[PDB]
């Protein structure tokens, strides 16, 4: 009931029967959620569970699509100063980041994201926090200074 693929998930680096599910606090002034603490999910690429080490750049972003499995699209809106006109300009681009199953995400919420090693060819970012923000209309159009 915890695995459903044509393989098995082992949660490497957790230990099974000696002792005295594995978790890691990944530092950066962050505490793992109780969801990841007491959950049943297994993922080899979760920052709190898998082999990925968080290092590099930390961003804040705007989730775009959730119906994609285990991954989400993060928009980052900003103003591009134009030297010629001394005026800003609305530009953006969306980065895909791996979302752990230990989080609940909805279209319209801010997510804090951290860099990891290349996870896919264009996915090398991981979620750490879900800030509830509930939105109206299409999530593409709203502009946030973050």
């Amino acid at each position: 009931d915890v695995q459903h693929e044509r393989a098995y998930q082992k949660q490497e680096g957790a230990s099974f029967f000696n002792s005295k599910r594995y978790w890691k606090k990944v530092g950066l002034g962050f505490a793992t959620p109780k969801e990841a603490k007491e959950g049943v999910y297994v993922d080899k690429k979760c920052p709190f569970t898998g082999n990925v080490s968080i290092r590099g750049r930390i961003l804040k972003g705007m989730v775009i699509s959730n119906k994609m499995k285990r991954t989400i699209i993060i928009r980052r809106n900003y103003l591009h100063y134009v030297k010629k006109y001394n005026r800003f300009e609305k530009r953006h681009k969306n980065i895909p980041c791996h979302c752990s199953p230990c989080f609940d995400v909805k279209e319209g919420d801010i997510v804090t994201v951290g860099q990891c090693r290349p996870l896919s060819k264009t996915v090398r970012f991981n979620v750490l926090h879900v800030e509830k923000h509930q939105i109206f209309g299409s999530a593409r159009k709203q502009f946030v200074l973050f």
Binding site: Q3, A7, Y8, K10, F16, F17, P96, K121, T122
Partner: protein, 171 residues
């Protein structure tokens, strides 16, 4: 051979420049099968010798519950989480399932504790029945194409049940 002449994430084409360098390399794959213990050696960049296993018969296999490991021999390969012709052609990979011997582990059991460190662990009745049959399954964990040896671990418990139910509501 690595990391170019693919499509951009937006779907557009990235037309090629930077004709292929050597550090990407991408050597052809090696298919290890059942046979005599013969291997080859490949020279990777920086003078690193890689132990290419083209045909393997035996290796180290570890009992995780007892925390031990002994040398024994694989006789057959039954399943891998990858495609099916890979196991049908008797190939070994780092998560494949093979059939491991029972007698050397039984002798270890007899010498260490007997009966037919951290001992007295109650083992498992299904594993004991498999040992009585003398044909116990295991999962290979080493990378034969890289390390050149077939180091496996004895499959047990819930994972054993999962790997068994998918094999035999079943054919």
């Amino acid at each position: 051979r690595d990391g170019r002449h693919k499509l951009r994430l937006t779907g557009g084409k990235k037309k090629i420049h930077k004709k292929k360098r050597k550090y990407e390399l991408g050597r052809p794959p090696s298919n290890t099968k059942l046979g005599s213990r013969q291997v080859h050696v490949v020279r990777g960049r920086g003078r690193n010798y890689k132990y290419r296993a083209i045909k393997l018969d035996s290796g180290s296999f570890s009992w995780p519950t007892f925390g031990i490991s002994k040398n024994t021999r694989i006789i057959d390969v039954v399943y891998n989480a990858s495609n099916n012709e890979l196991v049908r052609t008797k190939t070994l990979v780092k998560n494949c399932i093979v059939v491991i011997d029972s007698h050397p582990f039984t002798t270890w059991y007899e010498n260490t504790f007997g009966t037919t460190i951290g001992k007295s662990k109650n083992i498992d009745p299904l594993l004991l029945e498999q040992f009585k049959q003398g044909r116990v399954l295991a999962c290979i964990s080493s990378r034969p194409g890289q390390c050149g040896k077939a180091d496996g671990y004895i499959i047990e418990g819930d994972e054993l049940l999962f790997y068994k139910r998918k094999m035999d509501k079943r054919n």
